Ligand binder design. Structure first.
Ligand code: WQ0
Ligand code: WQ0
Ligand code: CL
Ligand code: CL
Ligand code: MG
Ligand code: MG
Ligand code: MG
Ligand code: MG
Ligand code: MG
Ligand code: MG
Lengths: 10, 230, 230, 10
């Protein structure tokens, strides 16, 4: 599994 | 560019329409045109730019990972490699476009701490996306460029922003990912992630009314990575 | 075209890779290149072609609907109309490309009943997608072209295919949608859908081992439309 | 709500 980076919001 | 004849405000308006229509390539093009007018971007406009290009490159990265996995499995005809290289070239073109905008237009000495941190984080990110697909002499240059951009963003954020600021948190998250995934430094990834989480909790009272949902989201994602990594 | 130097078999192989990577534009381009080699397509290849272009046009239709709804709401600045027209033009370009391939390469007097029905259904479909965005003199030409293509496909399917055949069922479903949504003929939509469902059930024993899941899926979708329409 | 047409499979 990959590390989670900043997602898209708004 | 092809957006040169359009008013800045119309370009912003069309980026928002494109977002609503989930037309992220169009959205990215509209925002590139807005940036090229050479005025600073607001918070709302930086978000549009970010969302547009992350969607575009995100789709390319996901495709690249699929093809790369097929390719690696078939090395245990040239067509898999050829198509992977095609997607890779397109991904690199998008990253180069973003890095060009940052360097030509967006990154300055002046302006908000927020804005300066945000653009240096973006530079770190799009160098990291290049680093995911890089191989040789090109790669070490790219990794150094990502670290440099991130590390400068970190220095500014720590001096100028509260520990719960979403840009500060988002930057620290992405830098920890860099450390873990690109730089092969799991200990530094973990220490940064832990430190970022703990200092945000310690100063939880600094949450902003207009962004606390974003802050808490990134805090949870820091915790998710820490659980995955230990 | 840009696919002219590539072997047919490599183009098919790359369409499959593109499907796996969810790169549907690339997939459509690869299949266009395969078609242009001027050999007939197998069932598996017809599916690749269908899936690729339906994904492309589907995304354009969904965007167009979003923009059209925003536009209609704001008629109760030119930017919404302009962007809608841009998406519309692109959608029409894709439909024209598909209809060109069908007319130049794929639709013949000879071949499988299946193949002939499938391509005439596809012609009906891409004319229907043009009809969704059409307005004037252009529109009645387009609607007539869709009906003509569908009606010819229906005649062949009824003579040459069992009532559970997935192409026959898929065609009847799409023609009923045409009747309801484009031709403004709800009674004809309902009668076709009912008749198609009932005759498939009556001859349920004709389900094929290699396609019965597809057949039953379309039968349920016929039932869903009938419930929505009554 | 829109009528459902043939979907993509396989
Ligand atoms: C005021 C301002 O600069 N707003 C725009 C940026 C754009 C997105 N970043 S971020 O990538 O650091 C980020 C994305 C998503 C979440 Br949930 C974040 F917390 C941070 C921050 C603000
Ligand atoms: C043998 C053959 O011609 N196969 C290809 C086609 C491609 C798809 N069609 S269809 O659009 O009529 C269809 C799509 C999806 C489902 Br679940 C169907 F039942 C039919 C049929 C076969
Ligand atoms: Cl290729
Ligand atoms: Cl436009
Ligand atoms: Mg202007
Ligand atoms: Mg390479
Ligand atoms: Mg304190
Ligand atoms: Mg060939
Ligand atoms: Mg028009
Ligand atoms: Mg019987």
């Amino acid at each position: 599994q990959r590390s989670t980076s900043t997602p898209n919001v708004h | 560019g092809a957006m040169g004849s359009m008013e800045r405000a119309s370009l912003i308006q069309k980026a928002k329409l494109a977002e609503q229509a989930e037309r992220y390539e169009d959205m990215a093009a509209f925002m590139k045109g807005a940036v090229e007018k050479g005025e600073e971007l607001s918070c709302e406009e930086r978000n549009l730019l970010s969302v547009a290009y992350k969607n575009v490159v995100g789709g390319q990265r996901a495709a690249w990972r699929v093809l790369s996995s097929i390719e690696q499995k078939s090395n245990e005809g040239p067509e898999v490699r050829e198509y992977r290289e095609k997607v890779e070239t397109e991904l690199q073109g998008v990253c180069d476009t973003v890095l060009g905008l940052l360097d030509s237009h967006l990154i300055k000495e002046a302006g908000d701490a927020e804005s300066r941190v945000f653009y240096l984080k973006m530079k770190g990110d799009y160098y990291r996306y290049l680093a995911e697909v890089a191989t040789g002499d090109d790669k070490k240059r790219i990794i150094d460029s990502a670290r440099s951009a991130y590390q400068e963003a970190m220095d500014i954020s720590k001096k100028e922003m509260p520990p719960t600021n979403p840009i500060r948190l988002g930057l620290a998250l992405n830098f920890s990912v860099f450390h873990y995934e690109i730089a092969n430094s799991p200990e530094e990834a973990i220490s940064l992630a832990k430190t970022t989480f703990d200092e945000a909790m310690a100063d939880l009272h600094t949450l902003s009314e207009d962004s606390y949902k974003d802050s808490t989201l990134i805090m949870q994602l820091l915790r998710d990575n820490l659980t995955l990594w230990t």
